[PDB]
Amino acid sequence: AKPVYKRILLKLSGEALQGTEGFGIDASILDRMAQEIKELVELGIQVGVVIGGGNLFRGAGLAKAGMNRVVGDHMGMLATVMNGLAMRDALHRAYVNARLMSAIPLNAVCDSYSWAEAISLLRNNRVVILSAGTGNPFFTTDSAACLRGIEIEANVVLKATKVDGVFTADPAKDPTATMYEQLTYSEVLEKELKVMDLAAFTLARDHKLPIRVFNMNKPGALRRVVMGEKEGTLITE
Amino acid sequence: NAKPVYKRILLKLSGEALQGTEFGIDASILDRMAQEIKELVELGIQVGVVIGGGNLFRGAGLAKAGMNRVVGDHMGMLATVMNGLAMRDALHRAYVNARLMSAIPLNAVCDSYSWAEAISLLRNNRVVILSAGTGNPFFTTDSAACLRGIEIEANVVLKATKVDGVFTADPAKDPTATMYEQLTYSEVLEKELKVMDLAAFTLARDHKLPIRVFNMNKPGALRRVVMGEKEGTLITE
Amino acid sequence: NAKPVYKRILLKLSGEALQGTEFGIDASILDRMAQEIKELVELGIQVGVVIGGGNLFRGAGLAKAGMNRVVGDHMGMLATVMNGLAMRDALHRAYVNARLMSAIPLNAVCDSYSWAEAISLLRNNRVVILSAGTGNPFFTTDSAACLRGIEIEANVVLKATKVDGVFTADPAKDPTATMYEQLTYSEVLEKELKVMDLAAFTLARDHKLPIRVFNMNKPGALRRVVMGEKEGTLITE
């Protein structure tokens, strides 16, 4: 009963790190994710992780408050980096070899994203955190996830969410919605389901980047997914 | 026919003063400070501005939750940049020439701190924002405020806080908390009042750098200081 | 007493359009575009220009020959810079204030892309060339053209190609290839015409960013577009 993936791209949204107040970072959560990621690395899995920033800032939201869209998306990106810092530290304190790279060159705090070094690091059993997303405004860390996954030739992008997977509708606002166990792009687009930003998904589809949606707040789920069990939704075609 | 009592200042904007209820950044406070800073610039005053990050993260805070103290300060310093980004945008949208420099090289998002480049810019009547403080862990922005304040040879360091001046304690927690209106670097010590952190204080005292503590949540407060009018607490030799 | 119909544009110069017979760069086309760009600048038009690299390398091309797709796009992106270098030189030798920025930091050879710095420069009537496109593999310059076009808030993206406009096919290969003169982001799709690559197209549609496709191998073509005269194909909502 060994793992069914060699290299994966873990997409961690900003919310995932949110405590109970709705903002910031919750030390306890980070530590738990570190233990889970750790188990995967021990299991011989090469882990790349793209983190979001919803717990701190979103360019759109700021833009609405009157701020320039580009600068909003910049601050939002810096936020992803601020999260990566937290994730990395947790990994380190748990004695897991990891390194933070940023699309937005941030000398001192971490090194800049380098596809070459990224791969080398991956082939050396080190967790590689890709913050600052794609580095461009008008994009979501989800795109970053798909882009970085195609780049590092990940076997699959695991989209962590506070939900067991993809439902016929929002399973928290419509007690009728049912989860899917298997899905294909054409279907997701056909029935117009919510998996992620269209651009990021279009890209994943264009390169047949399998996507799996699972719940990150469900202890063990991560492991079950990589160990090929019944967890969340699978997206391919 | 009054006219300003200062030629070039070092304005320290505390991050906490950018919250405006509930963490995050308060767009409206930002828009207001751009206006008040705009007036000073039209008034011919050169403005260097050190910004804090208390509204997002404090190294020490994170450390107690378990994070590595040094990574905590890094996140903290990165918050100042995030705040420096929003403050610059407010300036720009108010049509005020401003540039953002960071102690830790961000590149692209903003400029790296360049002492010489900062002097030139101030001379050409442009607001120079300094984020990432001193750029070293274990220090505060108050320290940077003094350090940069001396570097650019500012006439005084205006510490913009949330209260009218230096009090005998947190006026929000101790009903028995009075503020002073005059202090010598001595008195502050021979009374051990809450102004900054000895390291920064000593620095200013060392170079006979006056300090004035005032409230930025008070519209027009800054201008009054600039016009030499009864405002906040003055700290001199 | 006509005068320009645009204040600030995003000129996308395809690399292939710089060949002029046999790969490489055609000095004479370069000298000519500097002249036509010089007129627009004297005409008061702010010019941001995204340049391609089709005359030297295309990631996808190299990939089929066996190279790593990502290293291929890198080479590709580096070609755009090489083209950005020659275009800037032509501008300079024509006495036109121009600066070259790269998505991937070259430093020394040219400047790193700085959104803010780009806005300032355009405002001071200086040509801002953007090379290395989006700076990420798997994307085209057309994408960058739209991405940057939106960033600097350009009035329109002028895609400078080798043909008079968007055709039903490659007019050089399909004798049955007609071009249109008007299209809605819709029609382009509900006809599936050759304009760009959905990713870039969608982007422009998303932000109601008009696009006009014209021939740069036609001396004076650009100016006519700028003067709002029957030229190329117009793509709007």
Place this chain on the structure above:
Amino acid sequence: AKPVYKRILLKLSGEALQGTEGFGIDASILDRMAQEIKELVELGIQVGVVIGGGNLFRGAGLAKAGMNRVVGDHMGMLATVMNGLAMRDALHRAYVNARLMSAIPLNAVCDSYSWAEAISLLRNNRVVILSAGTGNPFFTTDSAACLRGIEIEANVVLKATKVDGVFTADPAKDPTATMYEQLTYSEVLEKELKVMDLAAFTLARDHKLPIRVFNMNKPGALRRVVMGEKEGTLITE
């Protein structure tokens, strides 16, 4: 009889490298320090070394000659880097794994200071040289020593000096002064003894960073100190 320290921060003043003319660097001295440092690394000790610049330049001294204080401190910092280069080379020629990092980003000659990589390097038995001090003007490499020591969580900062330790007065200008074998901050400050720049010391005290003053020109002293013998003065509290 094994070592009593696991990780130490070696503070080497500029003078230490001075030949007999009073300036520059003396090849012979460097080589000797390299052999001693080497022995420590072989002994399993993780060594971090902060070097000064007194043998070349001091910002204050230059300032007095009329030069700007900030630029003086800059040149002085560059000097620390110039020394590090020399120290590193010596370490390399003696086949000791070492790396120079600079607070002032100096691409090519060495890499920039990165707390993360610094620690990783330390955990890999490599000597880590921290030049350019803290990177800020108005500071001494002594502060840098204390700051870098607290950061890398060094077990103790060993302050090398051309004296056996801390005396009741200058043991070279008052034949009565006696050396201390043990001291505490409060005492040093109480009797106002000379250990180092007040700021650097205040910082060390604030974080209980044990400090040991010993003679670097006394062959073997370094080893005796780390091997817990009767050498120089100890400072804790």
Place this chain on the structure above:
Amino acid sequence: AKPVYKRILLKLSGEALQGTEGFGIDASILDRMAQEIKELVELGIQVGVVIGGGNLFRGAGLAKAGMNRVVGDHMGMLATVMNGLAMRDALHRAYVNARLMSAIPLNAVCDSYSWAEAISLLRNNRVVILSAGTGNPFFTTDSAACLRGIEIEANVVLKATKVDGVFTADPAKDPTATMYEQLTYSEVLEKELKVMDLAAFTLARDHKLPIRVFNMNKPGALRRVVMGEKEGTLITE
């Protein structure tokens, strides 16, 4: 019958990578050179490789077309980098440990040239590619070859050419010319033979950097040269 060189500097001209059209890169050729370089590394040889850009651009040629000489040499340098990218990829796909460094800092695509790291990498059996030449205009990659060879203390610079070696004249335009098996600088200069740019050669002579000219299109030649056989011409004194 083991190798007679421990560390070599392989000078690969741009032409060497040229397909049959006269320009660009030929995937097939790269792959073959990768296999040969691979054999050398397996053989315990430390390989440093300086690549040219003649297959893409030469500053002089561009200058003649009217472009600024400096910018011409810049684009030409970027070309060397574009080749290095190709060479590196080939090495990687052939599972040979290699790294591209550039004299012209090119963050992301590769790292910048660092003599220190270069040597460390060499001592670790990794191919080190030195692109962007010397980094200065008015120089040839040949100089770069000699300069980088003296720096990395290479045992010899192997100048690959599409000719078996150095002839009394051009062996392709004068069927009488004969190849030399052994030569000395004084002789090359005396009889004024074509080996490389005078500057690069003067430098090599000044430091007694043995030079060997051989044919790179002659499968096995590389190996024969390093295995001390009868191949090409030797240049020393």
Place this chain on the structure above:
Amino acid sequence: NAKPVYKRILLKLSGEALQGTEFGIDASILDRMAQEIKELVELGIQVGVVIGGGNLFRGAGLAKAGMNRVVGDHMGMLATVMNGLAMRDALHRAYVNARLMSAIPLNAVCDSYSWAEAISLLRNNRVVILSAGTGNPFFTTDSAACLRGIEIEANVVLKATKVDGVFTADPAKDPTATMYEQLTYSEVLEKELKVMDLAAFTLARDHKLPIRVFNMNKPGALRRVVMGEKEGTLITE
């Protein structure tokens, strides 16, 4: 009504000429050169200035003492920057617009060398100092002086030494040492005189770049050269 005989020059200031008795930098010589350079700038002369480091370190010197030659040149090159820092400060304190660029990127302390940026600056009547010479080991600043001199298209390279002109030997060591007042790149060779180092000399000869050697320890010497008056030795074709 004389007026200058040059529009733009390349002033090579030897480091040794900044000692003024005993190594180090002589504040008074610095203050004097700022004045003499100030006059040239007010006189409308564009000034690019290559600075040496002979007063602090010479790679070759260190090499003989045992250091790695390459690390020696690095230290050497870093001295030029240190000298470039003090010279810029003198300029600034004399109210002369000046910028310092380094061949090896220092960032923050000064600017990276930017050919284009240097041309723009000279055109806007600002002194552009070039430190770190060519930025490569094994070369001298004299080389950089010629290399940069050609790059910026200077009218002549003024080598500022410690003696009145090119002598038949060191006038301080050989009583039988006469200087010339006219030389052809030829004579210099067909007499093998002490002007620079063939590499740099050849370079200037290559591009018909005249050279004039004069004494900077002679107040007003520079201006006389600039005014085309009997001063130093002239080296032309």
